[PDB]
């Protein structure tokens, strides 16, 4: 089955209200940039971002010119002529609107609070979808907390019920309306709802992991923002998931959540796979089409793992644009983020940047020795490894933020489609490296094992293995006279 290729298409209210396809200074990446060729390479385009208003309904930003908005959306849906499988989804949320201290955070918390709020909100999502011509709903709340999770789950289930009905009513069996959410790609934010993962994903077609920004200006030392695997020389982190409300024993928590660990894409995928009831096919691996820049770094190792002087605050509290050669940075007033397009041009010029490669993380990085700069990003080469990983792990596909950051030739997007679909591309011999793999083992990813059937009335010594009710269990200590599942002395270690 075809891997999903989900591209976010983010467009600010100011750019919609002044939309044009002839002046990159106002609209840097208009829909016209998405040619029939590229439209064919994508499976989904996530139009971003919409919000939830104080009336607890889905809605466009208040400053949005609805007429312009409809026209932009129409240009996107127009792309479906070139790709019968293409879906134009819309995303609700994002950082600015939904983070704990974001402008509409309350609306999110409130909208999922009651059976009645959830119904009104669910109805509004479907209504927005049909009124503007979208093909599904994406929810990007960053991120619901433990006490809001049950409500969040109930709202998703409600939306699923409505979309399914709408699909039948519209005869959309060939391209059913979908529901997805952007999920945290790092243990810290993931810890907020991790315990109810199975329930969160049940009503979804896909959970799109934000497996990037795993390094930022808020971090102590510069690091790769989306390393596939771990680099023993890079920083390690506290495994926040051992603190999720899972209800597991110390033994269980410990084997699933090594701490500290390397904050990697592999870690995030495996952490999701460890949960029972989370199918790999619904997991989509996100990749970034932008890089994160650090200044004041110490040379010595390409600039990796060094202290820096990058303002981690948001917005960027300065007019100092230190990312040399990045006009985009001055334009958007922030030298900490740069699109792959800009970065490519930065390498194209002299600017004194050197592109290095980390064979453990399987990702590239830029280093500017003269100004002590470090840029972590991804490219067509790092994508080969991520694509192979997605196939090996039988994930649902890839997602990326965001389309408007690819180069004019659409090389990053073309690479992703090529690695999954080209008849003449073969990665069977691609060397995945020796980077550190996440070693955690949980209920959802237990090894297949065999063992004698547990026998009631038998006394087991420490370390004994038995099969009972589908799994293979091991005794944690000796003189065990009770059954697996009834005596806390048994540890589930294998399946089948």
């Amino acid at each position: 089955t075809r891997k999903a290729v989900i591209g976010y298409y983010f467009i600010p209210t100011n750019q919609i209200n002044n939309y044009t396809e002839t002046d990159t200074s106002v609209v840097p990446f208009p829909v016209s940039n998405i040619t029939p060729a590229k439209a064919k390479q994508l499976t989904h385009i996530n139009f971003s971002f919409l919000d939830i208003n104080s009336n607890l309904e889905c809605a466009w930003d208040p400053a949005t010119n609805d007429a312009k908005a409809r026209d932009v959306v129409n240009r996107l849906t127009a792309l479906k002529a070139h790709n019968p499988s293409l879906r134009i989804m819309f995303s609700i949320g994002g950082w600015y609107y939904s983070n704990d201290l974001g402008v509409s955070h309350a609306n999110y918390v409130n909208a999922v609070k009651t059976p009645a709020s959830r119904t009104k909100f669910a109805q509004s999502c479907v209504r927005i979808m049909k009124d503007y011509g979208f093909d599904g709903v994406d929810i990007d709340w960053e991120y619901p907390q433990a006490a809001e999770v049950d409500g969040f789950i109930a709202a998703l289930q409600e939306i699923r019920t409505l979309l399914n009905q709408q699909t039948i009513t519209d005869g959309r069996q060939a391209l059913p309306y979908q529901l997805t959410i952007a999920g945290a790609g790092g243990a810290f934010f993931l810890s907020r709802y991790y315990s109810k993962l199975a329930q969160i994903v049940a009503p979804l077609d896909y959970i799109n992991l934000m497996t990037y920004d795993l390094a930022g200006p808020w971090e102590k030392v510069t690091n790769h923002q989306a390393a596939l695997f771990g680099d023993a020389a890079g920083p390690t982190f506290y495994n926040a998931l051992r603190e999720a409300n899972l209800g597991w024993s110390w033994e269980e928590l410990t084997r699933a959540f090594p701490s500290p660990f390397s904050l990697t894409v592999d870690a995030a995928v495996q952490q999701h796979l460890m949960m029972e009831g989370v199918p790999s096919a619904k997991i989509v691996m996100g990749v970034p089409f932008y890089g994160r820049a650090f200044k004041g770094v110490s040379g010595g190792n390409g600039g990796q793992y060094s202290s820096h002087s990058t303002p981690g605050e948001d917005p960027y509290p300065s007019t100092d644009y230190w990312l040399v050669g990045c006009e985009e940075c001055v334009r958007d007033k922030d030298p900490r983020i740069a699109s792959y397009r800009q970065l490519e041009q930065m390498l194209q010029g002299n600017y004194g940047y050197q592109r290095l490669w980390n064979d453990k993380t399987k990702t590239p990085y830029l280093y500017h020795a003269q100004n002590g700069l470090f840029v972590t990003y991804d490219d067509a080469e790092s994508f080969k490894y991520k694509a192979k990983y997605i196939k090996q792990q039988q994930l649902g596909g890839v997602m990326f933020w965001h389309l408007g950051q690819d180069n004019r030739n659409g090389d990053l997007l073309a690479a992703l489609d090529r690695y999954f679909n080209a008849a003449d591309y073969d990665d069977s011999q691609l060397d995945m490296g020796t980077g550190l793999r996440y070693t955690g083992v949980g209920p959802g990813n237990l090894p297949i094992m065999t063992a004698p059937a547990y026998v009631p009335g038998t006394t087991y010594a420490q370390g004994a293995l038995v099969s009972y009710q589908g799994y293979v269990w091991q005794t944690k200590w000796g003189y065990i006279t009770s059954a697996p599942g009834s005596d806390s002395a048994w540890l589930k270690v294998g399946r089948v």
């Binding site: 950082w95 934000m210 948001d314 933020w401």
Partner: peptide, 5 residues
């Protein structure tokens, strides 16, 4: 923060 976050 800065992008998707």
């Amino acid at each position: 923060r800065x992008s998707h976050x």
